């Protein structure tokens, strides 16, 4: 869910097992060095959706759907500037790759049992 | 300042736009057949690509130019 995604991205921020962006995310996918992924659908994506579904239809790549590109960029560590309340300017991200190691948490179990369903 | 010689300008680089999307050829079936060659070095994995020029194939970092 949303709070489980926030927890796993905060664990990625606290344990540096994170691969943001597009180029290094696809590189970590092709390196067999990935655990989880997300995706932002229903946007202005003429070719990006078909390229990323070809990229994620490879080896049990998990996805979490989200409406906008905006609130994904708050719990990932994108624009951690002006922390006095609301953020100043957060740019849009599409997908992120998480390869957490210290996964002794309830939220990982919740999201993984949600994935095996 | 104002000098007699013409001013030398720095390398005004061009901005890319979805480069790897031009090399992952995707059809309506389950095929991900690529347009660019992968790396032959075992230092890294299989993520980076090589240069596709008209007469040679250059690395990103291995600097192993492939001739014809």
Calpha distance A101→A15 (Å, rounded): 8
Q: What is the DSSP letter of B21?
A: G
The approach used to solve this structure was cryo-EM
Contact criterion met (CB < 8 Å) for B45 and A22: no
Calpha distance A97→A56 (Å, rounded): 11
Residue pairs between chains A and B whose CB atoms are closer than 8 Å: 32
State how many domains chain A has.
1
Calpha distance A1→A65 (Å, rounded): 10
Calpha distance A39→B2 (Å, rounded): 54
Q: Which domain holds residue A69?
A: 1-117
CA nearest A32 in B: which residue? B45
Resolution to 1 decimal, in Å?
3.7
- Do residues A90 and A31 lie in contact, with contact meaning Cβ atoms separated by under 8 Å? no
SS3 state at B20: helix
CA-wise closest residue to A67 among A39, A86, A106: A39
Answer left, alpha or beta for residue A20, where phi above 0 means left and psi between -120 and 50 means alpha.
beta
Under 8 Å CB-to-CB from B51, ≥6 apart: which residues? B57, B58, B59, B60
Outline where chain A has alpha helix (H): 2-15, 23-30, 48-56, 106-115
Residues of chain A contacting B47 with CB distance shorter than 8 Å = 24, 26-28, 30-31
CA nearest B33 in A: which residue? A54
């Amino acid at each position: 869910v949303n709070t489980a995604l926030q927890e796993v991205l905060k664990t990625a921020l606290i344990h540096d097992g994170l691969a943001r962006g597009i180029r290094e995310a696809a590189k970590a996918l092709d390196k067999r060095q990935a655990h989880l992924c997300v995706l932002a659908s229903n946007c202005d994506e003429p070719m990006y959706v078909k390229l990323v579904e070809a990229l994620c239809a490879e080896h049990q790549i998990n996805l979490i759907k989200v409406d906008d590109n905006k609130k994904l960029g708050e719990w990932v560590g994108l624009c951690k500037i002006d922390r006095e309340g609301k953020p100043r300017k957060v740019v849009g991200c599409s997908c992120v790759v998480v390869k957490d190691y210290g996964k002794e948490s309830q939220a990982k179990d919740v999201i993984e049992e949600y994935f095996k369903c | 300042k104002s000098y007699t010689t013409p001013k030398k300008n720095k390398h005004k680089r061009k901005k890319v736009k979805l480069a790897v999307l031009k090399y992952y050829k995707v059809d309506e079936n389950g095929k991900i057949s690529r347009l660019r060659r992968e790396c032959p070095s075992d230092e890294c994995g299989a993520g980076v690509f090589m240069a596709s020029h008209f007469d040679r194939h250059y690395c990103g970092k291995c600097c192993l130019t492939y001739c014809f």
